[PDB]
Amino acid sequence: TCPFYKKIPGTGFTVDAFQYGVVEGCTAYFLTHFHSDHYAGLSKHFTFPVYCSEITGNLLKNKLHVQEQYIHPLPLDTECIVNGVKVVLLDANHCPGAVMILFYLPNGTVILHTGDFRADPSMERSLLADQKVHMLYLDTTYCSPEYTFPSQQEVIRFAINTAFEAVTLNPHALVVCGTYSIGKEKVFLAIADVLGSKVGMSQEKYKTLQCLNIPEINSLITTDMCSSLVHLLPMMQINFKGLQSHLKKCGGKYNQILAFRPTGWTHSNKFTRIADVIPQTKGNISIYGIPYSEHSSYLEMKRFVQWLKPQKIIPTVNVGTWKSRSTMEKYFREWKLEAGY
Ligand code: NI
């Protein structure tokens, strides 16, 4: 049965609620983004209207084979009427195709559902600027002050400089980057651009990337691994055993691997600056964990909420423990007392 924080009151609508069977009273199912915890339950046999971005609808049709007649893609930044209710989709600054959803309820209440997001000051000049929001359904993934990480731009600067140094010292080194979902594509695209290479990958991953409307993508990726010196592998293979095995397969073209694992936050963030990050190494293999986040840091989240000044906050992440819930509620009251709303 569907939890309350996936239902939008005063509507026939749910958000990210495909794993509960037929939800009583639901006339339209919204999907914020194509990550498995959110799409869990969708398949070619789904026969209700799904509302989403264009990029998410390309992935639904090609990867999960949802039939076209039930996919309802909406443009961003545009007022749309769905089953008699005004909605807007906003970029979430998460993975490709990820949205926030503004619902304008028939009684005058305005609700923002962030989906998964990385708050940014640019959102203070979207269509959010124009009216009051009563209720905020908030991605609280990193809602505690220990969660610090650098900007995406600093992280990419580190990765490009590291890869270009390594490969210029040793033209026979291979670069490998881990992946298990969409998101974080800048990591491997920025490294391949500095090296003058396409990114090589499996047929299944190439197919996924071809649904993302990234400009000039045919110029940047390939399934011909022999032609590429930046390879993508499943995240589970980014370890000394898996990388050794991969290097065997390349037929003596390479004699060193430099590998990247884009994680979210790890506790090595509480001590070390991006500048000072070092790899784990075994023989001719080195592995870097780099803190490339597609969720808000604590400070980014706090700025957003203190700007928006919602009347009520409903967390959508970390909701399963009383300790988590009490922590989050304490920070929400602090922010409200400090800002004065
Ligand atoms: Ni996500």
Say how far apart CA 218 and CA 200 lie, in whole Å: 12
Which are the contacts of 81, defined by CB distance < 8 A and separation ≥ 6?
87
Q: 103: closest CA among 13, 18, 28, 29? A: 13
In sequence order, what are the beta bridge partners of 281? Answer: 286
- The one-character DSSP state at 29 is E
CA end-to-end span of the chain: 35
**Tokens standing for residue 4:** 């309350």
From the centroid of its chain, how far is CA 6?
A: 19
Q: How far is the CA of 195 from the centre of ligand 1 (A)?
A: 29
Say how far apart CA 225 and CA 246 lie, in whole Å: 12
Which are the contacts of 128, defined by CB distance < 8 A and separation ≥ 6?
90, 102, 112, 308
**Tokens standing for residue 115:** 């989906």
Q: How far is the CA of 183 from the centre of ligand 1 (A)?
A: 8
Say how far apart CA 277 and CA 102 lie, in whole Å: 39
Q: How far is the CA of 255 from the centre of ligand 1 (A)?
A: 36
Q: How far is the CA of 231 from the centre of ligand 1 (A)?
A: 24
Say how far apart CA 34 and CA 20 lie, in whole Å: 17
Q: 53: closest CA among 6, 98, 8? A: 98
- Amino acid letter, residue 187: V
Q: How far is the CA of 181 from the centre of ligand 1 (A)?
A: 9
Q: What's domain 148-295's architecture?
A: 3-Layer(aba) Sandwich (3.40)
Q: How far is the CA of 144 from the centre of ligand 1 (A)?
A: 19
Q: How far is the CA of 319 from the centre of ligand 1 (A)?
A: 16
From the centroid of its chain, how far is CA 334?
A: 28
In sequence order, what are the beta bridge partners of 14? Answer: 7, 29
Which are the contacts of 124, defined by CB distance < 8 A and separation ≥ 6?
307
- Resolution in Å equals 1.3
Which are the contacts of 295, defined by CB distance < 8 A and separation ≥ 6?
94, 116, 117, 118, 139, 141, 142, 264
Q: 20: closest CA among 3, 36, 43? A: 3
Say how far apart CA 138 and CA 32 lie, in whole Å: 13
**Tokens standing for residue 65:** 């084979």
Helices 152-169, 185-195: inter-axial angle, 10-degree rounding? 40
Cβ atoms of residues 39 and 64 within 8 Å: yes
Cβ atoms of residues 7 and 14 within 8 Å: yes
Say how far apart CA 241 and CA 270 lie, in whole Å: 29
Cβ atoms of residues 20 and 1 within 8 Å: yes
Question: E strands of 56-125, at which residues?
Answer: 71-73, 80-82, 85-91, 99-104, 110-113
**Tokens standing for residue 197:** 């290479």
Instruction: Please state the domain extents for the chain.
Output: 1-147+296-341, 148-295
Q: 257: closest CA among 273, 278, 277, 242? A: 242
- The one-character DSSP state at 303 is H
| 232 phi-psi bin (left φ>0, alpha ψ -120 to 50, beta other) | beta
- Amino acid letter, residue 64: L
Q: 54: closest CA among 83, 36, 80? A: 80
Which are the contacts of 183, defined by CB distance < 8 A and separation ≥ 6?
35, 94, 95, 96, 294
Say how far apart CA 326 and CA 217 lie, in whole Å: 45
Burial environment of residue 240 by CB neighbours within 10 A (0 to 12, 13 to 18, 19 or more): middle
Cβ atoms of residues 280 and 286 within 8 Å: yes
Q: How far is the CA of 146 from the centre of ligand 1 (A)?
A: 21
Q: How far is the CA of 316 from the centre of ligand 1 (A)?
A: 12
Cite the DSSP H helix spans in the chain.
36-39, 54-62, 152-169, 185-195, 203-210, 240-249, 298-308, 322-339
The DSSP secondary structure of 196-265, one letter per residue, reads T-PEE--HHHHHHHHTS--TTGGGTEES-GGG-SEEEEEGGG-SHHHHHHHHHHTTTS-SEEEEEEEES-
Q: How far is the CA of 116 from the centre of ligand 1 (A)?
A: 5
In angstroms and rounded to an integer, the radius of gyration of the C-alpha atoms of the chain is 22
Top-level CATH class of 1-147+296-341? alpha beta
From the centroid of its chain, how far is CA 267?
A: 20
From the centroid of its chain, how far is CA 246?
A: 27
Q: How far is the CA of 114 from the centre of ligand 1 (A)?
A: 11
Helices 322-339, 298-308: inter-axial angle, 10-degree rounding? 50
Measured from the Cβ of residue 108, the count of other Cβ atoms closer than 10 Å reads 8
Q: How far is the CA of 329 from the centre of ligand 1 (A)?
A: 23
